[PDB]
Subunit: 217 residues, 4 copies
């Protein structure tokens, strides 16, 4: 093969590569839209007396995760599996949001922390040992941090709604998360930054617990 | 034409373009001053017992917008209405400030969100249909985000002023704003940036409701 | 003159300049040490769970400002008064801290804002425009901004100390500083940036007043 | 010697120098693990309700330090007891952390600041006037700064753990540290950078007491 041919072929691969980014971009936008709609179905838990609106809200959110599943399926049909971390940054943001939403729906129903692989099943993505689209560890942890912030906010609204028990559950849960994030050696600049914001969330939850205790819980 | 003749010609053009920027810059300066004066008239609502000064301060603010209309009329005189977006960056700031101030005066009076079109009327500007200095969606939304920040601060001062009802209206209002922004797919980086500060205003006001609620108010 | 003759001459001028800067550096280091001592002396106010120590602390600080005057007299000896701005950068930092400290002393004693001329008198330095070593308007305002931050901190500690009246006075004060800075059409980028921090102090002190108020007093 | 011989000889010194780094990093790796195991024990006491657990965890933390003494002894094995500052950069981080954990243990046991020499004894290394392998002022101060950050958190958890006395003591402790560093010129290193973060913790801790005294403290 000659120099001119070789570079023409290179011109080919680069053009294909760029077409992949485009298909990816279209799928991600659709994913962000669906993620916004799911957040809207859940944000409602913050308003009103009591929390009767849960599991109705969780049901609707889960049904909507159906669209996330097909789009993630479609997203996988856009690039070579081993190219994951090459294009990964295109959906970093929406994947972390999806983790948060999945974790929020699971915490609202069971008050537990969804497992990294359980998130995988909800998103229709592949487990960390099934070759395909995977759920990175830093994206999982980022989602959990967003959860924490959501939960700190929920404990305040819970009292406004007349629920003086939930805040004590959230408090315990958030202290545990903080415990774990400290037993971890996060070397990802983004994660450290995010983790740095957990203190504010832990501070907000202590004030509520305190206000409750003082008045007899 | 020689390269020299071509460039001598481009000099006149650039020189003409720079005279326009200079002209626009002086009008914008007057505009920014009138804006600071209007803000000064309104932020007085943050002190003292009660809110009996609201009507009076809103009246003085609106009268001062008369000067605003005057300067925007002159500003339109300083450039081809066709090159709006070529010189937009010069007044982007004060325009967003003016949107905030108009929205603030409308909210203080009616507790509602002024319409983009209505802001256009308060400023003596033209709606998207009248070709002549338009009010961007991006600038409108920036002004609204600045409004939310001012309102979360007002919520706190309302309680200090002895008004335990406003905080509740403000929190509902800011949550409607949050819900509204969630329907959007923001592309502008400045706006998307400012938009991330809304959740802080949402939490601040929800915390005031909480404090009021946990004390039977 | 030959190239070497020109440079041998410039070497002399540059050498004398270096010596001036070195002499300035030594006096500045002394000044910064005294400033640090005055601060330590005044920060005791944040722990004095009674605040009856104010006069004592202020008098001791003033006693120390006697040492500041001597060091500044010496500083005036190390360079040509004609070129104050050629070397201003060397003492800009400590000059601003000294403005803050003097203003912190006067506020503690009288709850008023020290005059720039009055700070000039406390430093044994000269008035404005001409006559010798001067206190720039920008160095003065930077010092005032530093004071606002210290005061927002004082408001919090005043409550812990059982004084619920001081927070109200501080809030009024910082709000007047905010109004004052509004009137200025700040051009200096450094001052402009520092001024952005004032907004945070205004809200922080207003929240303290809010806490006291919703809680009763 | 010929150029080739000079470089063949240099190749050997560099390869030996590299083998030492590989050995050092191996020991520094285990040290960092043990350090994490200790942090787990200490930070795992932040709350509960205030128990006799503090002494129990401090002793287990001390058992673990028995492991630290051994590994450091092994570390002194990997390099010439004369090229300390040459390889210092490799364990700089872990040492600072060990200083912090040591100070944390001592603070929990006696509410005192562990002396630099006492840290030397806990780590099984020698005094800064002994011989091989010391703890310089630089790394000691860094460890103390990290201590302060943990203190802000310890304080928040104590409140969420029914204990309301702890915060008052922590606040006083932090302010003494603040005054201590104030006496220092710190005309050296990023230590100055770490220091600038102490003010944050100081305010954070004072805020906790503020919350508590919002009643009768």
């Amino acid at each position: 093969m000659s120099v001119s041919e070789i570079f023409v072929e290179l011109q080919g691969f680069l053009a294909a590569e760029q077409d992949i980014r485009e298909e990816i971009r279209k799928v991600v936008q659709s994913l962000e839209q669906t993620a916004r709609e799911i957040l809207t179905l859940l944000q409602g838990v913050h308003q009103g007396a009591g929390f009767q609106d849960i599991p109705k809200r969780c049901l609707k959110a889960r049904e909507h995760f159906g669209t996330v599943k097909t789009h993630l399926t479609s997203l996988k049909t856009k690039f070579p599996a081993e190219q994951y971390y090459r294009f990964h940054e295109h959906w970093r943001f929406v994947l972390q949001r999806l983790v948060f939403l999945a974790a929020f729906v699971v915490y609202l129903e069971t008050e537990t922390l969804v497992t990294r692989e359980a998130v995988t099943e909800i998103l229709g993505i592949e487990p960390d040992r099934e070759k395909g689209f995977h759920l990175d560890v830093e994206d999982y942890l980022s989602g959990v941090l967003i959860l924490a912030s959501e939960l700190s906010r929920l404990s305040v609204n819970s009292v406004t709604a007349g629920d003086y028990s939930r805040p004590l559950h959230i408090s315990t849960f958030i202290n545990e998360l903080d415990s774990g994030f400290r037993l971890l050696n996060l070397k990802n600049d983004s994660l450290r930054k995010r983790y740095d914001g957990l203190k504010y969330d832990v501070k907000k939850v202590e004030e509520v617990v305190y206000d409750l205790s003082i008045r007899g819980f």
